[PDB]
RNA sequence: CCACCCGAGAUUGAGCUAACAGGUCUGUGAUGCCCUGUCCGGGGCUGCACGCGCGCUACACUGACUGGCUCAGCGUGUCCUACGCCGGCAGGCGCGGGUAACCCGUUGAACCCCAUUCGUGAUGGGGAUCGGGGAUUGCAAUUAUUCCCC
């Protein structure tokens, strides 16, 4: 394929994997 | 069980994920039958019409498409769906159906499974 | 007299402020007065924006010589100012965490349960994926905290290691080369100093391990 | 690279500093030749009967207008810009990010696609040339800098 198009394909497939895996405040205190 | 394939055109890329399902086709989260240019609608719909809706009745696919223009995106999508079905019937279904289906696609159109390696030429000083 | 010396840190002139800061650091490192200055720093942060970095520099230079409850309260206030999105306060307080965990404090200053709690609390930020100024500090302070936790209680540290190793492996997908080298160096340091000498104690691990051997299998 | 075994020899003798077409620097020839401008203000830099050529926009119906829908890449950036408010528009104010695969930016581009108006009409094609006003960059826009509205 070549560098640029394969790079776009790889990142696109990675984003599709993450959106398949997808389907609160920070811990402000140390002790409960 | 699921597979993930890709198809391409000049710059347009389509990544297709193929999972066990019931026969709903998603491209960019949108259904197959609503992609903007209707004049190329059958160009989007050729694998289903050649193979029949009964071969798609036990599977679902989602395609993310990036790059290119309208027509290049359509061609990358149809390459992606054809390669996704070929990969699925190769990996989790018996090989004879995969070979006969691959023969049907390649006798109708080579670009359904083989990428067209044409791109814009560069201009040199 | 200590309060009078301490009150001139927030004085806006750099020559007055730097002299007061260095004097307080020399007095504490040369302690019954640690509680008072820790409470003063906590109240000075809670009152306030450019002086925040100043008593954060105080906290960076003075965290190891503090009692455990005051360390806990200081870290709670520090995560409270981590709720803000300001960058300089984040970098300076990560430097404060680096100075806190780098000195390897004793059990009186820092306990193992407190270290585990602050390790679990620090997982919530991980700036995005590719920021490379705060992610470096975040990896470094988590490395030092894990080293200190293993030094205090080794089995709990090895138990908490697989999550950090998984996040480091995920962070190895960043396009920056420096964060990749830093993650490799950090995991190498943890493997050499915190994982290797305890393997005679752990013994052989199979697919059905239970204790720290299962954690070793998980980070493998 | 070091040391050592074997081996006659794991290095014993001869010949070769040099070079400046890159030059530089206050010197040497009563050295050959040829002679005895600066700052300042204003204007013009194609002003246009014409000849010879590059280009841009069109002569419309495979089109113009209005709305809707939906897709790039090479680059560049302490001037690129996100966002909030005001104005109908150019534009104005404030507040953030970016010395950068981190922010503009998932670069929501145009042709294209889908509906409306138009109907062979120098006409809703085509925009030149003008009249009025606003805004912006500059010390300064007059002989129209550039943009916007009618």
UniProtKB/Swiss-Prot annotation, chain A:
Localization (cell): Cytoplasm; Nucleus, Nucleolus
Residue numbers bearing the Phosphoserine modification: 6
Tissue expression from the record: Found in the placenta from the sixth week of pregnancy. Was localized in the cytoplasm of the syncytiotrophoblast in the chorionic villi and in endometrial decidual cells at the uteroplacental interface. After week 10, the level decreased and then disappeared from placental villi.
Domain of life assignment: Eukaryota
SUBUNIT field: Binds trophinin, tastin and cytokeratins.
Other comments on record: HeLa cells lacking BYSL show a delay in the processing of the 18S rRNA component of the 40S ribosomal subunit. HT-H cells lacking BYSL show trophinin-independent signaling through ERBB4.
Family indicated by similarity: Belongs to the bystin family.
Job of this protein: Required for processing of 20S pre-rRNA precursor and biogenesis of 40S ribosomal subunits. May be required for trophinin-dependent regulation of cell adhesion during implantation of human embryos.
Protein name: Bystin
Gene: BYSL
Swiss-Prot record, chain B:
Keywords, sorted A to Z: Acetylation, Cytoplasm, Nucleus, Phosphoprotein, Ribonucleoprotein, Ribosomal protein
InterPro entries, per database record: Ribosomal_Su5_D2-typ_SF, Ribosomal_uS9, Ribosomal_uS9_CS, Ribsml_uS5_D2-typ_fold_subgr
UniProt record, GO biological process: cellular response to leukemia inhibitory factor; cytoplasmic translation; maturation of SSU-rRNA from tricistronic rRNA transcript (SSU-rRNA, 5.8S rRNA, LSU-rRNA); ribosomal small subunit biogenesis; rRNA processing; translation
GO CC terms, sorted: cytoplasm; cytosol; cytosolic ribosome; cytosolic small ribosomal subunit; extracellular exosome; focal adhesion; membrane; nucleolus
PROSITE patterns hit by this protein: RIBOSOMAL_S9
Primary subcellular site in the record, as a coarse category: cytoplasm
GO molecular function: RNA binding; structural constituent of ribosome
Subcellular location, record wording: Cytoplasm; Nucleus, Nucleolus
Modified residues (N6-acetyllysine): 53
Origin: domain of life: Eukaryota
PANTHER family for the chain: RIBOSOMAL PROTEIN S16, RIBOSOMAL PROTEIN S9
Known function: Component of the small ribosomal subunit. The ribosome is a large ribonucleoprotein complex responsible for the synthesis of proteins in the cell. Part of the small subunit (SSU) processome, first precursor of the small eukaryotic ribosomal subunit. During the assembly of the SSU processome in the nucleolus, many ribosome biogenesis factors, an RNA chaperone and ribosomal proteins associate with the nascent pre-rRNA and work in concert to generate RNA folding, modifications, rearrangements and cleavage as well as targeted degradation of pre-ribosomal RNA by the RNA exosome.
Quaternary state and interactors: Component of the small ribosomal subunit. Part of the small subunit (SSU) processome, composed of more than 70 proteins and the RNA chaperone small nucleolar RNA (snoRNA) U3.
Similarity field: Belongs to the universal ribosomal protein uS9 family.
Protein name per its UniProtKB record: Small ribosomal subunit protein uS9
Origin species: Homo sapiens (Human)
Encoding gene, per UniProt annotation: RPS16
From Swiss-Prot, chain C:
Localisation: Nucleus, Nucleolus; Nucleus membrane
Tissue specificity statement from the Swiss-Prot or TrEMBL entry: Weakly expressed. Expressed at intermediate level in testis and ovary.
Superkingdom field: Eukaryota
Coiled coil: none
Family named by the database record: Belongs to the RRP12 family.
Protein name stated in the entry: RRP12-like protein
Species, as recorded: Homo sapiens (Human)
Residues of the full protein shown: 237 to 472 of 1297
